[PDB]
Amino acid sequence: MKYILVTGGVISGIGKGVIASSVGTILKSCGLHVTSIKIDPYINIDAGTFSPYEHGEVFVLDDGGEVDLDLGNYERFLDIRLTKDNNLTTGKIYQYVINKERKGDYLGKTVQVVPHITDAIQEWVMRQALIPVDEDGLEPQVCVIELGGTVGDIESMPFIEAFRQFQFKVKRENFCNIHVSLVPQPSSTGEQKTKPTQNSVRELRGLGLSPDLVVCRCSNPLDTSVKEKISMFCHVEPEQVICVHDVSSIYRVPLLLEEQGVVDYFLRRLDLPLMKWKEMADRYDRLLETCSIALVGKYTKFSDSYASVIKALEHSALAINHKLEIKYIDSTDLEPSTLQEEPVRYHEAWQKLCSAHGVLVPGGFGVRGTEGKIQAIAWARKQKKPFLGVCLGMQLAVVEFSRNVLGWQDANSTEFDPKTSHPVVIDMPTMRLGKRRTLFQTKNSVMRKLYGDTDYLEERHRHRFEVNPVLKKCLEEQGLKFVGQDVEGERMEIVELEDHPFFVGVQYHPEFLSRPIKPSPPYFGLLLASVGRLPHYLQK
Amino acid sequence: MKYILVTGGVISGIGKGVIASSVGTILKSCGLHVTSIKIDPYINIDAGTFSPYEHGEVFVLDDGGEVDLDLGNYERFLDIRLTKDNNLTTGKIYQYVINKERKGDYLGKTVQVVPHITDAIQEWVMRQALIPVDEDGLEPQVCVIELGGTVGDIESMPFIEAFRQFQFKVKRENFCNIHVSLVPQPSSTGEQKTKPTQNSVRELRGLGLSPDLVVCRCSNPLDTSVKEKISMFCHVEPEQVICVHDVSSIYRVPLLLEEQGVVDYFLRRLDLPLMKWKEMADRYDRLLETCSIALVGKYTKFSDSYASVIKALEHSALAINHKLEIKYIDSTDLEPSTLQEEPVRYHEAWQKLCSAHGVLVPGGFGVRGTEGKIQAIAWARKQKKPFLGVCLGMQLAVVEFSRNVLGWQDANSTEFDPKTSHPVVIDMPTMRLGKRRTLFQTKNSVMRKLYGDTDYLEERHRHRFEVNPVLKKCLEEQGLKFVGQDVEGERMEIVELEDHPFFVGVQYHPEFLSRPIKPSPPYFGLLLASVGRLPHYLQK
Amino acid sequence: MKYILVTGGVISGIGKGVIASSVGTILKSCGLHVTSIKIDPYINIDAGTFSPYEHGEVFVLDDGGEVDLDLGNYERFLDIRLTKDNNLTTGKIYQYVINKERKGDYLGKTVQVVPHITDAIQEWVMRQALIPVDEDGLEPQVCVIELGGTVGDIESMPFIEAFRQFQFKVKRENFCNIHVSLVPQPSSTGEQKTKPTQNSVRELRGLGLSPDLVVCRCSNPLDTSVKEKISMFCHVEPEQVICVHDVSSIYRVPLLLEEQGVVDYFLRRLDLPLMKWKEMADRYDRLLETCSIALVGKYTKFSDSYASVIKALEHSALAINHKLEIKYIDSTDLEPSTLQEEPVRYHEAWQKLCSAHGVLVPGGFGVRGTEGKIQAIAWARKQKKPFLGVCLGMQLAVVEFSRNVLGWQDANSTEFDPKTSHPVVIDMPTMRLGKRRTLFQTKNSVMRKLYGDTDYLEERHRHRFEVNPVLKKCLEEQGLKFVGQDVEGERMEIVELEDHPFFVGVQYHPEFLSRPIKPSPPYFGLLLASVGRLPHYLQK
Ligand SMILES: CCOc1cncc(-c2ccc(C(=O)NC3(c4csc(NS(=O)(=O)C5CC5)n4)CC3)nc2)n1
Ligand SMILES: CCOc1cncc(-c2ccc(C(=O)NC3(c4csc(NS(=O)(=O)C5CC5)n4)CC3)nc2)n1
Ligand SMILES: CCOc1cncc(-c2ccc(C(=O)NC3(c4csc(NS(=O)(=O)C5CC5)n4)CC3)nc2)n1
Ligand SMILES: O=c1ccn([C@@H]2O[C@H](COP(=O)(O)OP(=O)(O)OP(=O)(O)O)[C@@H](O)[C@H]2O)c(=O)[nH]1
Ligand SMILES: O=c1ccn([C@@H]2O[C@H](COP(=O)(O)OP(=O)(O)OP(=O)(O)O)[C@@H](O)[C@H]2O)c(=O)[nH]1
Ligand SMILES: O=c1ccn([C@@H]2O[C@H](COP(=O)(O)OP(=O)(O)OP(=O)(O)O)[C@@H](O)[C@H]2O)c(=O)[nH]1
Ligand SMILES: NC(=O)CC[C@H](N)C(=O)O
Ligand SMILES: NC(=O)CC[C@H](N)C(=O)O
Ligand SMILES: NC(=O)CC[C@H](N)C(=O)O
Ligand SMILES: [Mg+2]
Ligand SMILES: [Mg+2]
Ligand SMILES: [Mg+2]
Nearest residue to C413 (alpha-carbon basis) of C345, C367, C479:
C367
H or E segment at C390?
strand C387-390
SS3 assignment, position A408: coil
Residues A276 and A289 in one domain: no
Provide the residue range defining the domain that includes A202.
Answer: 2-281
Q: Which ligand is nearest to the CA of C310?
A: 3
CB contact under 8 A, A186 and C304: no
Nearest residue to C329 (alpha-carbon basis) of C379, C374, C369:
C369
Task: Give the CATH number of the domain where residue C158 resides.
Answer: 3.40.50.300
Q: Is C206 on the interface with A (CB under 8 A)?
A: no
Q: Cβ distance C496 to C526 under 8 Å?
A: no
CB within 8 Å of B275: residues ≥ 6 apart? none
| Atom 6, ligand 1: residue with shortest CA distance | A246
Give the ligand 9 atom nearest the CA of C364: 3
Residue type at B141 in one-letter notation: Q
Distance, CA of B394 to CA of C437 (rounded, Å) = 105
Q: Cβ distance C404 to C520 under 8 Å?
A: no
Residues C267 and C344 in one domain: no
Q: How many helices (H) and strands (E) does chain C have?
A: 19, 21
Question: Which member of B54, B110, B154 has the closest CB to residue A42?
Answer: B110
Largest CA distance in chain A: 74
Q: What is the dihedral of CA C242, C246, C251, C252, to 10 degrees?
A: -50
Residues A153 and A71 in one domain: yes
Residues C232 and C305 in one domain: no
Q: Cβ distance B60 to B512 under 8 Å?
A: yes
Nearest residue to B512 (alpha-carbon basis) of B22, B86, B72, B85:
B72
Q: Which ligand is nearest to the CA of A150?
A: 4
Question: Distances from the Cα of B12 to the Cαs of A68, B55, B144, B406, in angstroms?
Answer: 41, 10, 18, 50
Q: Which residue among A58, A412, A465, A467 is best mutated to probe the pocket of ligand 7, counting the most ligand atoms within 8 A of its Cβ?
A: A465
Residue type at B374 in one-letter notation: I
* Residue B509 falls in the annotated catalytic set: yes
H or E segment at C494?
strand C492-497
**Resolution for this model in angstroms, one decimal place?**
2.4
Residues C254 and C331 in one domain: no
Distance, CA of A471 to CA of A481 (rounded, Å) = 13
Residues A368 and A463 in one domain: yes
Give the ligand 3 atom nearest the CA of C312: 23
| Residue B194, ligand 5, Cβ within 6 A | yes
Q: How many CB atoms lie within 10 A of CB C429?
A: 9
DSSP secondary-structure letter at B483? E
CB within 8 Å of B23: residues ≥ 6 apart? B4, B6, B144, B178, B257, B262, B266
Q: B113, B166, B205, B225: best mutation site toward chain C, by most C Cβ within 10 Å?
A: B205
Q: Are strands C59-60 and C66-67 parallel, antiparallel or unpaired?
A: antiparallel
Distance, CA of A51 to CA of A74 (rounded, Å) = 21
Q: Are strands B480-486 and B323-330 parallel, antiparallel or unpaired?
A: unpaired
| Residue B232, ligand 5, Cβ within 6 A | no
Distance, CA of B297 to CA of A165 (rounded, Å) = 39
Distance, CA of A432 to CA of A463 (rounded, Å) = 5
Residues B299 and B274 in one domain: no
CB contact under 8 A, B108 and A158: no
Distance, CA of A509 to CA of A375 (rounded, Å) = 22
Residue type at A19 in one-letter notation: I
Experimental method: cryo-EM
Q: Of A260, A281, A302, which residue is a domain's last?
A: A281
Q: Cβ distance A309 to A511 under 8 Å?
A: yes
CB contact under 8 A, B207 and C207: no
Residues A270 and A326 in one domain: no
In DSSP notation, C234-289 reads TT--GGGEEEE---SSGGGHHHHHHHTTHHHHHHHHTT---HHHHHHHHHHTT---
Question: Distances from the Cα of C323 to the Cαs of A279, C232, C284, C349, C520, in angstroms?
Answer: 49, 43, 8, 21, 17
Q: Is C191 on the interface with A (CB under 8 A)?
A: yes
Peptide bond into B115 cis (omega under 30): yes
Q: Which of B33, B315, B461, B509 is catalytic?
A: B509
Residue C455, exposed/middle/buried by CB under 10 A (0-12, 13-18, 19+)? exposed
In chain B the first and final C-alpha atoms are separated, in Å, by 46
Peptide bond into C418 cis (omega under 30): no
What is the number of CB-based contacts under 8 A between chain A and chain C?
A: 60
SS3 assignment, position C393: helix
Please give the tally of structural domains in chain C.
2
Task: Give the torsion sign (CA, C276, C277, C282, C284).
Answer: positive
Residue type at A191 in one-letter notation: E
Q: Of C281, C307, C335, which residue is a domain's last?
A: C281
Residues B305 and B211 in one domain: no
Angle made by CA atoms C369, C372, C373, in degrees to the nearest 5: 90
Q: Which residue among B299, B464, B486, B493 is best mutated to probe the pocket of ligand 8, counting the most ligand atoms within 8 A of its Cβ?
A: B464
Q: Which residue among B195, B198, B230 is best mutated to probe the pocket of ligand 5, counting the most ligand atoms within 8 A of its Cβ?
A: B195
Residue type at B271 in one-letter notation: D
Q: Which of C161, C258, C335, C511 is catalytic?
A: C511
Residue type at C26 in one-letter notation: I
Distance, CA of C537 to CA of C501 (rounded, Å) = 13
Peptide bond into C115 cis (omega under 30): yes
Count of alpha carbons within 13 angstroms of residue B525, beta-carbon side? 25
Task: Give the CATH number of the domain where residue A444 resides.
Answer: 3.40.50.880
In DSSP notation, B228-261 reads HHHHHHTT--GGGEEEE---SSGGGHHHHHHHTT
> Taking the CA atoms of chain C, what radius of gyration do you get in angstroms?
25
Q: Of A236, A259, A281, which residue is a domain's last?
A: A281
Count of alpha carbons within 13 angstroms of residue B298, beta-carbon side? 21
Residues C32 and C179 in one domain: yes
* Residue A391 falls in the annotated catalytic set: yes
CB burial readout A122-140, b (16+ within 10 A) else e: bebbeebbeeebbeeeeeb
Judging contacts by C-beta atoms under 8 Å, the chain B residues touching residue C163 are: none
Distance, CA of A61 to CA of C3 (rounded, Å) = 58
Distance, CA of A380 to CA of A360 (rounded, Å) = 10
Residues B86 and B198 in one domain: yes
In DSSP notation, A225-241 reads HHHHHHHHHTT--GGGE
Residues B296 and B264 in one domain: no
Q: Cβ distance B304 to B69 under 8 Å?
A: yes
Residue type at B498 in one-letter notation: E
H or E segment at B522?
helix B521-530
Q: Cβ distance C289 to C323 under 8 Å?
A: yes
